[PDB]
Structure 1
């Protein structure tokens, strides 16, 4: 129960326009930051037994794996080179806190237990934590109201109002899979969750839990969920999970068997024998049909959220959101682009806006226009026989 790690983020200046009010808000943020900096400086400018204890502690302390603690002052430790020694335990160590497998600390020369180092989290899993917070609030997601509602009910309401569920003896969904075509808000709705959540967010990509050696992928998955459970509440976002989790066929190769083994370790973590803490999982997928049923099972993935290509009103929302910060001209009616019944993702709409801005800049004009938007729409979109029906 170390506690939530959160992600420090500065306030948001409501007026996106360049005006004095924005200047005042930013100046207030800056002046508070300056006061904090000077306070730290003044603390350190106005500022024995433990020092000698640390001197007695080895200078280049080594890290070794405790194994089969014995007696009350003698334990067997490992040197991380396979060798193991019947070392002694100084009084400095906590005791009643050493457990087998714990990465204790050893004096370099005499090899005596002198520390416990209960923070031996692998770098591969420490990197995949979220310390910043992307500035994609839910107000940057045009439409997707139902999807936002589902994910809020899954990963936000259980933390902000944990009385509704206890009031009817219901466990909220622990798993969500966001599936859809290539670019519809699947990753925005994880960015927004990270931005607006007080829980430890853990980015991951399915193609990252796979490791070169044997038994390392499952070990990494176990470590990832162990840290996600130590820090609680926590959310684990596995983007593009079809990297690992595809159908479990009868393998003939060895790498494929190892990948499936990693997938089974993930399945056991999601819903295994023992239990699961307050760790909530959000997977993302382009092609859900190819995923294994055991993974899509509605005990590991309680909610499945489709992100279809936006309809007309959602498309209008996307254009509004992505042209808000643009000096749109009064000649532009963002309806001609909406009406055309062509596959337009939110990514396609943003690319359309960017290309319209670039067309204006090419024409030497800083204010976009309708012809610019038409040209951008034509030149951004890259990609049944006639008369066969009707």
Structure 2
């Protein structure tokens, strides 16, 4: 007890918060600060030195800077990926059965059903790269959700996490590569790829460095990376040959029949009236994804649920359809 309450002199008044740079195998690490002060001191207790993941903020002192403790960082990583297993499988959507069996056969052959993968002796651990004209996570998450049935998943949506802060660099990509290293049986999903589309000179070098570390120059077959953008013309031609090496496919235009199937899937569990017609619903829409029709299915089920009824009448589903007609025109 006294030995536990005797190191209080180091963590007392002379205490600071620094940024550690790296750990040296010679039991003396190098730290930094706003002016970059490098002090090497033999390690102390309360530190892990293994899960610390150097390159983050640690605790320093006004003394010789003996490391007395650490502080966890980035709660921002929590909003990166989902850890749940949704019930949406590859058999819940139709029409693109070949388009979904191309990626299912593409990334579900490694690490699962390995007699057609390890006996051949190819191992292209790169995965396909897709793009959805509707986007907004509906089609791209309806194709990536096939891998989410029984497996670990890794999700990355939007290039904002690189542009919402100072140019720290590819260190966050190194965090995704170390969590993918410690989580090898996973699927890397990059969504809303608009790095160059949205300083600007550093975005090109952290994007080309993203291509460098994404190529896997030192790592063996560890994880299948699946990228997903919105516009194929925003990506430079240099990000294609190193990144996309397995296969790519095209997605048809969802005008009437794909919106009819999306409407059927979004209206399969719900109960609708007999007078609810389909031609006006697949007619009034114009280049719409599934998030807004899911929004009017939610507010239509709640609005119809106001009368303590689960049946959605035709006039109430057109009254909710006015949100679709207005939102895309606004």
Q: Same fold by TM-score, threshold 0.5 exceeded? A: yes
Change (3 A) 1:263 1:343: closer
Change (3 A) 1:172 1:330: farther
1:316, 1:186 → 2: CA distance? 15
User: Contact 1:352 / 1:380 at 8 angstroms: preserved in 2?
Assistant: yes
Offset at residue 280 of structure 1 (A): 2.7
Change (3 A) 1:207 1:56: closer
Residues 342-384 of structure 1 deviation map (CA, whole Å, 9 limit, x = unaligned): 7565456546656766886799986334566567667734699
2:65, 2:308 → 1: CA distance? 73
User: Contact 1:312 / 1:339 at 8 angstroms: preserved in 2?
Assistant: yes
User: Contact 2:80 / 2:157 at 8 angstroms: preserved in 1?
Assistant: no
Change (3 A) 1:356 1:170: same
My pick for the range that moved more, 347-356 or 280-289, is 347-356
Residues 105-135 of structure 1 deviation map (CA, whole Å, 9 limit, x = unaligned): 7788564457799999xx4445423334556
Aligned to 2:202: 258
2:78, 2:55 → 1: CA distance? 19
Residues 169-218 of structure 1 deviation map (CA, whole Å, 9 limit, x = unaligned): 12245233331323486555268638825555333233324346764143
2:136, 2:33 → 1: CA distance? 51
1:54, 1:191 → 2: CA distance? 55
Offset at residue 288 of structure 1 (A): 1.0
5+ long unaligned stretches in structure 1: 1-46, 247-254
Change (3 A) 1:59 1:355: closer
Change (3 A) 1:189 1:67: closer
Change (3 A) 1:105 1:186: same
My pick for the range that moved more, 361-370 or 206-215, is 361-370
Give the number of aligned pairs: 330
User: Contact 1:142 / 1:321 at 8 angstroms: preserved in 2?
Assistant: no
Larger gyration radius, structure 1 or structure 2: 1
Change (3 A) 1:185 1:88: closer
User: Contact 1:175 / 1:302 at 8 angstroms: preserved in 2?
Assistant: yes
My pick for the range that moved more, 341-350 or 149-158, is 341-350
User: Contact 2:130 / 2:229 at 8 angstroms: preserved in 1?
Assistant: yes
User: Contact 1:61 / 1:107 at 8 angstroms: preserved in 2?
Assistant: yes
Offset at residue 266 of structure 1 (A): 1.0
Change (3 A) 1:343 1:119: closer
2:78, 2:323 → 1: CA distance? 42
Residues 60-110 of structure 1 deviation map (CA, whole Å, 9 limit, x = unaligned): 987766779889666665567622334234599889999997988778856
Aligned to 2:179: 227
User: Contact 2:285 / 2:325 at 8 angstroms: preserved in 1?
Assistant: no
Quick one: which of 315, 326, 330 aligns to 1:382? Answer: 326
TM-score (norm 2): 0.69
Offset at residue 265 of structure 1 (A): 1.4
Residues 262-285 of structure 1 deviation map (CA, whole Å, 9 limit, x = unaligned): 211111122164346523323222
My pick for the range that moved more, 210-219 or 190-199, is 190-199
The 5-angstrom pairing of residues 338-353 of structure 1 reads: 345-347=289-291, 349-350=293-294, 353=297
5+ long unaligned stretches in structure 2: none
My pick for the range that moved more, 159-168 or 344-353, is 344-353
Residues 302-353 of structure 1 deviation map (CA, whole Å, 9 limit, x = unaligned): 3334332347664443233222232222344646756999756545654665
User: Contact 1:141 / 1:188 at 8 angstroms: preserved in 2?
Assistant: no
My pick for the range that moved more, 215-224 or 279-288, is 215-224
Q: SS at 1:237's partner residue? A: strand
Change (3 A) 1:157 1:312: farther
CA RMSD of aligned residues (A): 5.6
My pick for the range that moved more, 255-264 or 206-215, is 206-215
Change (3 A) 1:109 1:56: closer
Quick one: which of 231, 240, 247 aligns to 2:192? Answer: 240
Offset at residue 158 of structure 1 (A): 1.9
2:309, 2:51 → 1: CA distance? 68
Change (3 A) 1:234 1:95: closer
